[PDB]
RNA sequence: ACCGAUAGUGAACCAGUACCGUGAGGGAAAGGUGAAAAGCACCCCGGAAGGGGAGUGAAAUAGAACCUGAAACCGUGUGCUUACAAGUAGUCAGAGCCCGUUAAUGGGUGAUGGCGUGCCUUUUGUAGAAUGAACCGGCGAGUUACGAUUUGAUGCAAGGUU
RNA sequence: UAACUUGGGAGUCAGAACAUGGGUGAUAAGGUCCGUGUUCGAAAGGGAAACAGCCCAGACCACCAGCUAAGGUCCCAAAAU
RNA sequence: GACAAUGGUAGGAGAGCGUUCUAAGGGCGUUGAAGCAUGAUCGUAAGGACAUGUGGAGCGCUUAGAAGUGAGAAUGCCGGUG
C-alpha cells in the first residue's frame, strides 16, 4: 500500500524546494528524516513535517509498519503567486513574484 | 518496392594489399578510393559502408610527373594569427611518405560521419612489410 | 410548403466579402491596389 | 524460377505465390488475370530473351482493388501570398501470382 | 548588455546540471543511536566523546 | 445577431499542432512556429517525391556498372549492346538479376557482347 | 431573426466607487457549490495552515482559492535514442529495438545517406545585418440610410405604378 | 486562329540585368538617357562551385518505368582512365 | 469515348466550406446535450463523422432567410505565463 500527505500553499518558491526534495526521493524513511534534519536549507522543516505526516497516516489510517517504508514519491508543484512591487529609481517600479508551492510525499512499504 | 538494401549482417569485407611502387600519386589514389567506398560491389548501398580494407606497401616509391617535387606545396594553418606552415611534396615523401598517400587518398572521400569511418580502413606503410598478416590480405592489381 | 422553398433560378447571388483570406483574392488590399490616394479609406478625387 | 512482367509502364519480378500491387486494372475482385508481355522467364535452368518471350503468360488472381493512403500536396511561394492544397489517393489492384 | 534572444528550456536545463546540493555527510552516533554530523556533537541527547 | 467566434479557432489550430509531432522543441508545441514548419514540410515533400525517382535510377546505374566490370565491360558498352540486341529490361530489373542470379547476368552479358 | 459578463450602460457587483489630480476633471476591475447547507460530528500527524480517513450528498478533482476547466508555463515516472561532432532543425530512403489500431500496403524511436539560408510587409532586387512579432487566449478592419447607373429575376404591356 | 464594336470591373504611371544601334562620360562605372529583342518582375526544374536578370526548359496530381536539351564521363559525384 | 488544356503577383470571373440567429418540417437527450481530451477514419480544399474518457442539460438534420460571419503579424488593447 501507499500513504500520502500534502502541504498546500507553502510560502517558499518551488524551485527552492525541489533542490532538497531530490536528496530524499528514493531513500529509506529513517534515513530521509535525518537528512531533512541535518541540512541547512530553509525548506527542510516544512518537508520534514510533511514527511512525518505521511509516516503517521500509515500507522493509523491504513495499518502498516513504519520501519519498512521508503519514500516512493516526493514532488513540489506550483501554487498561486503573490504580486508585490519594488519602487526603483526615476519613478519606475518593478514587479516581485512571491511564489508558493504544494509539497506532496507518498511513502510505500514496497507492496 | 523491390530494391535490395544492404544491412550490417549481410556485409562481408575482404582485405587487399597494393604495391605503390612505380605508380603515380593521383592515379593510385582515385582507384584506392573507389575500392574504399565499395563502388566495386554489386550489393552497394549508399547509407552503409560495403567497402573493403586496403594495405598500401612500398609508399616511398610513389612518384610525381614533372617538376612536382619542388612545386606542389602543402599549406596548413594553426589557427593562431600568422601561422601558415608549408612543406613541398618532395620533402614530405622523404620524411613522412605514408602521410602523403593518406592525405591524398582521404581528400577523395566524402566528409561525412560515414566518410571518416570509410577512410579509416586504409593502412599505408613505407616499406614492403606490414603487420596485418593475420587477416589474409589478398593481393589486388590496379588497372 | 414553407419547408421547401426555392427562388427562381438566377434570382439571388452571394455578395462579395473583401478582407477575409487570400484564397478569395480580395483579402489583402481588398482589390484597391498598393499605396496611393485611391487606396485610402476616405476616397479618391471629386468626380469629373 | 521467376519472371519479369510489364504491366503499368513498369517491369516487375514475380515468383509463384507472391503478392504484387500494380496499377488499376479493369478486372474485378475474385477473377483471374493473364499477363502477356513477359521479358525474361526462368532463373533455374532456362533463360530467355526479349523484347518478348513469345509465350509464357503469367497467370494471377485479382486479390483486391483499392486505393492508397492520402498524400497532401501542399505548396506555397514566399512573400507572394500564393499557396495551394490538394489531396491524393492513387488506386491500385493487388494480385497473387498463381502460375508462371 | 541584454540577451539577444530567448533561452530554450534545453539550454536552461543543461546549464542547471551542476546546480544542486549534496547529502549532509553524516554518521551514526554510537551513544545516541541516531544520526549526526561527523566531527560535530550529537544534536540529540548526547555528547562528542572524541 | 452577434457571433462570438467560439470553438472554431481552436479546432483548426489544433489540427496543425498535431500534424507536427516529433518536431524539436517549440516546433511541436506552439502554433506560429509549428505552422511555418508544416508549410516547409509540405514543400519539401513535394520536391523530394520527384528527386526520389532520380536517386534510385542513380543507385541502379551504379550496381549494374559494378556488376558489368566483373565481366570486363563498361556500363555504357553493356547498355549499347543490350539496346542493339533488342532486349528491353529496365535498370531496376537488370540490377535485381545482377544480385540474385549471376548465371543470368552472364547470359545477358554474353548476348550484349555478341551484339557488339 | 437585440447583448449574454473582454459582450450589454462607465457600473448584472453595495461604481461614478478603489483611486489619481491643487483643481476643473478622469475611471476601472470583481458573476455561477448543491435540488436542500444537509457547509465535513468524530479519530490521527502538526504550534497553526494544511492534510488522511470516516461521515452528508446522486456526485467532495462539488469543501466556500466552490459549474466546465483549455493553451502557454512548471513538474514526476517511464519505451526507443544520444559524450569525434559543424545542425532554418525538416523532408525522402533506411537497419535495429519496443508495441498492436476506426484493420490497413499498421503505431513509436531513428544508427546512417541525399536535398534543404523561417514568416509577413516593402521593393528593380531581402536568407538578409531593411520592418514587425517573447509565448498563449479573447477582442479587432469595405457596413447602413438616401440617390444614380448597369446586369439577372418576376408581373403587366402603348402602357407601367402609386 | 484570331480581330473589331458596345457595355459592367479593375490594376498600372519607382522598373532591373544581358545582347545589339546610338548620345553623354574619359570608346570609366553594377553610371545615365533613348531604339530593338530576351529573361526577372509574376517562374519552379537542370547547368554556371555558391549566384533575381546568363545557357537549356515553362511544374494538374501519382509511379522504386523510358528517351533527350544545356552541360558532362579519374575520386568527391550519375556516365569513356 | 476521342482530341486538347491546367506556373502566376496586382486584379477580374465562377463554385463552394464553416460560424451565431429566424421560419416550416422531421428528430436526438439523465439508458446522458453541448463543450473538452485522445484515436491508427472520410472528403480534391475549406472541413464532415464515429468510438472511449469526462461533464451535467441542452442540441443537431433538411429547405429557405438575415448577418456584430472565419485573424500569426497593425512598436495592436486586455488577461495569464515564461
TrEMBL record, chain A:
The keyword rRNA-binding applies. Keywords: Ribonucleoprotein, Ribosomal protein, RNA-binding, rRNA-binding. One of its GO terms (molecular function) is structural constituent of ribosome. Coiled coil: none annotated. Pfam families: Ribosomal_L22. Signal peptide: none annotated. GO terms for cellular component: cytosolic large ribosomal subunit. InterPro entries: Ribosomal_uL22 (IPR001063), Ribosomal_uL22_bac/chlpt-type (IPR005727), Ribosomal_uL22_bac/org-type (IPR047867), Ribosomal_uL22_CS (IPR018260), Ribosomal_uL22_sf (IPR036394). One of its GO terms (biological process) is translation. The globular domain of the protein is located near the polypeptide exit tunnel on the outside of the subunit, while an extended beta-hairpin is found that lines the wall of the exit tunnel in the center of the 70S ribosome. NCBIfam families: rplV_bact. Belongs to the universal ribosomal protein uL22 family. HAMAP family: Ribosomal_uL22_B. Part of the 50S ribosomal subunit. This is Large ribosomal subunit protein uL22. It comes from Staphylococcus schweitzeri.
Automatic annotation (TrEMBL), chain B:
InterPro entries: Ribosomal_uL13, Ribosomal_uL13_bac-type, Ribosomal_uL13_CS, Ribosomal_uL13_sf. One of its GO terms (biological process) is translation. One of its GO terms (cellular component) is cytosolic large ribosomal subunit. The keyword Lyase does not apply. It comes from the Bacteria. SUPFAM superfamilies: Ribosomal protein L13. Keywords: Ribonucleoprotein, Ribosomal protein. GO terms for molecular function: mRNA binding; structural constituent of ribosome. Part of the 50S ribosomal subunit. PANTHER family: LARGE RIBOSOMAL SUBUNIT PROTEIN UL13M, RIBOSOMAL PROTEIN L13. Belongs to the universal ribosomal protein uL13 family. This is Large ribosomal subunit protein uL13. It comes from Staphylococcus schweitzeri.
Automatic annotation (TrEMBL), chain C:
This is Large ribosomal subunit protein uL15. It comes from the Bacteria. It comes from Staphylococcus schweitzeri. The gene is rplO. Residues 1-48 are annotated as: Disordered. The chain holds residues 2 to 49 of 146 of the full protein. Belongs to the universal ribosomal protein uL15 family. Part of the 50S ribosomal subunit. Residues 41-48 have a biased composition (Gly residues). Binds to the 23S rRNA. Residues 1-17 have a biased composition (Basic and acidic residues).
From TrEMBL, chain F:
InterPro entries: Ribosomal_bL20, RIBOSOMAL_L20_CS, Ribosomal_protein_bL20_C. One of its GO terms (cellular component) is ribonucleoprotein complex. It holds the Pfam family Ribosomal_L20. One of its GO terms (molecular function) is rRNA binding. The keyword Ribonucleoprotein applies. Transmembrane segments: none annotated. Keywords: Ribonucleoprotein, Ribosomal protein, RNA-binding, rRNA-binding. GO terms for biological process: ribosomal large subunit assembly; translation. The keyword Cytoplasm does not apply. Binds directly to 23S ribosomal RNA and is necessary for the in vitro assembly process of the 50S ribosomal subunit. It is not involved in the protein synthesizing functions of that subunit. Belongs to the bacterial ribosomal protein bL20 family. PANTHER family: 39S RIBOSOMAL PROTEIN L20 (PTHR10986). HAMAP family: Ribosomal_bL20. This is Large ribosomal subunit protein bL20. It comes from Staphylococcus schweitzeri. The lineage of its organism: Bacteria, Bacillati, Bacillota, Bacilli, Bacillales.
